[PDB]
């Protein structure tokens, strides 16, 4: 690991939410283990911990890989209350994932009962433009709709903003 | 002898409170023959802990805390998604106790080893393994790790269905998720110390009854220390008079002398094996009043008939003057020699008189042989279904005895048949031994009835104990352990089959052995049983293994709490609570107290470890007799996933045995309702008496009394208190848990007739679970309704309600009570048998069979099921001034 100096490091409970098959797990495995997972293992609720320095400021990252099969429509109230930041993730090759973006937005905003909360919209699977069904402008418009930063990632072997998406969400929390 | 045995002898004496040297001085040949003949029970138990040494030692220290039946109730299975539970596996990732998690969804009926197999599948996703490669890593690691509950020291060491473990099934019923973790077998096996049991130094050292042609005659001589008066005698076979009681002459107290033989209406050869003499010194002024009682077995532990002169130190009469004799009392001389004595002589014949061996009994039974469906079957079925307190007319006693050969088709009628046999004769008792020799085994709950004071025959005890060795699971054994230890007092001798059964189980199950030790240690102050239990603890402590070191650390911990509470009540009693606190914090911050109260196992639950205690949370409660509110920290690495602070109430000055029994009955009633389909959530919190009116109370978290809730906010305050702590979506789940918990305690408190409920006797949790805590006195003090359900509770049950009643919410609450009431009524024999086994205890409200008759009234056992329901509906209507009419 990486032994951090000082003590009592800030801990950010980053929660990754999104529909099934979007890529929430593969993005998280890439950020923590630097490896792309191609298989189909639907996630119920897994957690990941790591110590990294962001903008010359160490911090503890507790990332929660939520479910997507909707079979576990519960458990949402739990991580949507203790989470310090959220990563709305949709797939550019699955139109159904794009309509559910504001479905998660009103959930997080109501459960938090705030005017707004640190969120970042993630357009995943941009390595498959031959089957892409959501343009970049469609994601930009949805991002400006809820006043949310936007980023395009792809958990494939080419990295593509996997670390930046998490690190930006840590940056949003520090300046929210 | 061995200096290692001297070290062991000092630890055994510290745990039991008396040095082992005192047992070496007891000249009683039964005491010495017990200490040697009991050591093979220790050998056989140690041999079981060494058969397959890796796994068996682990199965002993951490026994699988599972339930009895692998199957689930239908309402429990419906709480599952396609019969699958979601478990949450945790793992430490950094040396700073940082933990990650990953959730599994597996069938409930799966082996823990299969849960580990699914865990490897979930973890090896970033490994990029093929289908054949996944099989290699599984079969290489599936079987080298063990599941452990996160928070406590509970493990999954056996191939039980996962839903059969109590923690898993408790999660299912409560709608929670199991929090488990993996641990390698070799890391758990390496922490298991080796047991080193060695045989102690003390391990190394006629005429038949049926040939005596005479009647029983006992001579009463004189009486000293008596300080007119006569002596009343009697021959009983465990509560049943064998012959009519005879009385001596009426002499004044000037020179207490009788010097007279008493002829009894009983043939000497016709005496049973369990025959006892019950005598007493009575006064007379008409006004017949007993002064002192005493009992003695007509046979000793070697089957020898009593003969010769003997003094019998009598026992003081307890509160209440019943019949002049006391057959139910203990037999034997009083250890305190200041009590009045009594000199007796038993008739000598020629040589030693022995009870005939079993082969001679067979000869007489075969000889006396030479000397159906329309109603005989149904009557035998109706006789068996009656409660053990119901009377059996003499006609039915002969009817059972005449059909004793057909009674083998319904072995549950055996308790009724044993009471029908005239034990005064020997031809019938000889035949009864042949039936019991080949009587079909019965259920363990039924065989416990054959172990109370009404069945003293050794062959009868042997049948009940054998029924326990086959059918009594370790789950049920720990449930009825308090009764099985009490009926050890009813045993005529030290060496019997029930004490060897309990000792072997306690020495092959540390969860059994833990409460086994504490139940015995609690009654060690009582000199009536201090020798029977003290000798039992010595054999246990000498073979329990490493757990003795843990017990000594628990004994010294409780000992320091007693000493502190004693000085608190004698030195700073009338002082203000502030002054008491300054005295408390000083006597606790000293090093000798901190080292004894930190780093030991919780007596309420040995799986819960008690690390360092948070002195700032320890306080003297504002209740009666100044209870100690103690708060330890959970030293488990994943303690946050279960509980972080362990809170225990140490109560000194009040007898907590009544609370133990009521809490044990509440737990049993809940298991009755649950397995039938009645989801009524009772809260039987922990409670363990550890001595003379000293005990521990388990603290339940997030619970508040009604008086506290009322001050934290007049009638609708309780209803608003739940809506604030339960959102609009959880509101329906909170009022549901409230109605189901009220229906349970409304029925439980009525049947048991507990103390009256008030705003400080009733507590409510944040989720809406209701329960009681006080439990002053059960049974008797127009039946008493302690839980009256005030209008504050009716508001919560019926939500927003104009009149609370005539509402479907209240109608569904009435249905929950009716179904729960008739459910407990269908198991009346069990609770009656559980109360019967407690009569030998010092329970002031469980001395006579008249107190046990209270539940016979509240259950309306003499009426039909339709009538017994209308009965319960009346006392609820009378106690509530309406709402239970429906006529
Ligand atoms: N080509 C490509 N495939 C991707 C990408 N991200 C995810 N996938 C694929 O999409 C599938 C599902 O990915 P997964 O990470 O399980 O999605 P999820 O959003 O976590 N689903 P759930 O919530 O049901 O577990 C897998 O086949 C995975 O390899 C990506 O950037 N590119
Ligand atoms: C008077 C008393 C010591 N007592 N006497 C006989 N039985 C009890 C007894 C038994 N319990 C309790 N008290 C108990 C008390 C307080 C409590 O929480 C505190 C924080 C509160 N709400 O003020 C939780 C409790 O848990 C149930 C077990
Ligand atoms: Mg996932």
Author numbering:
A (entry chain B): 3 to 178
B (entry chain A): 106 to 310, 324 to 345, 353 to 410, 417 to 502, 523 to 864, 873 to 940, 949 to 1054
Pull text from the paper.
RAS proteins cycle between inactive GDP-bound and active GTP-bound states. Mutations in RAS and PI3Kα are major drivers of human cancer. Their interaction plays a crucial role in activating PI3Kα and amplifying the PI3K-AKT-mTOR pathway. Active RAS interaction with p110α, along with phosphorylated receptor tyrosine kinases (RTK) interaction with p85, activates PI3Kα, allowing it to modify its lipid substrate, phosphatidylinositol-4,5-bisphosphate (PIP2), to phosphatidylinositol 3,4,5-trisphosphate (PIP3). Here, we present structures of KRAS, RRAS2, and MRAS bound to the catalytic subunit (p110α) of PI3Kα, elucidating the interaction interfaces and local conformational changes upon complex formation.
We successfully isolated stable complexes of RRAS2 and MRAS with PI3Kα using gel-filtration chromatography, reflecting their higher affinity. The RRAS2-Q36A mutant exhibited a twofold increase in binding affinity for PI3Kα, while the MRAS-Q35A mutant displayed comparable affinity to wild-type MRAS. Crystallization of KRAS-Q25A, RRAS2-Q36A, and MRAS-Q35A with p110α (105-1068) resulted in crystals of RRAS2-p110α and MRAS-p110α complexes, enabling structure determination at 3.1 Å and 2.75 Å, respectively. Despite similar p110α binding affinities, the MRAS-Q36A mutant formed better-diffracting crystals than WT-MRAS, possibly due to reduced conformational flexibility or altered surface properties. The rα1-rα2 loop and rα2 helix adopt distinct conformations in the p110α complexes with different RAS GTPases, driven by residue variations Y38 in RRAS2, and its equivalents, I37 in MRAS and H27 in KRAS. While the switch-I region and β2-strand are closely aligned across the RAS proteins, these specific interactions cause KRAS to rotate by ~3 degrees and MRAS by ~6 degrees relative to RRAS2, emphasizing the structural adaptations from isoform-specific RAS-p110α interactions. In MRAS and RRAS2 complexes, the guanidinium group of R230 forms salt-bridge and H-bond interactions with D42 of RRAS2 and D41/D43 of MRAS, respectively. Notably, as R63 in RRAS2 is not conserved in MRAS (I62) and KRAS (L52), p110α residue D203 engages uniquely across the three structures by forming hydrogen bonds with R63 in RRAS2 and H53 in MRAS, and van der Waals interactions with R41 of KRAS. Overall, interactions between RAS and p110α-RBD extend beyond the switch-I and include residues in the interswitch and switch-II regions. Structural analysis shows that RRAS2-p110α and MRAS-p110α complexes have more H-bonds and salt-bridges at the interface than KRAS-p110α complex due to non-conserved interface residues in RAS GTPases, providing a rationale for the higher affinity binding of RRAS2 and MRAS with p110α compared to KRAS.
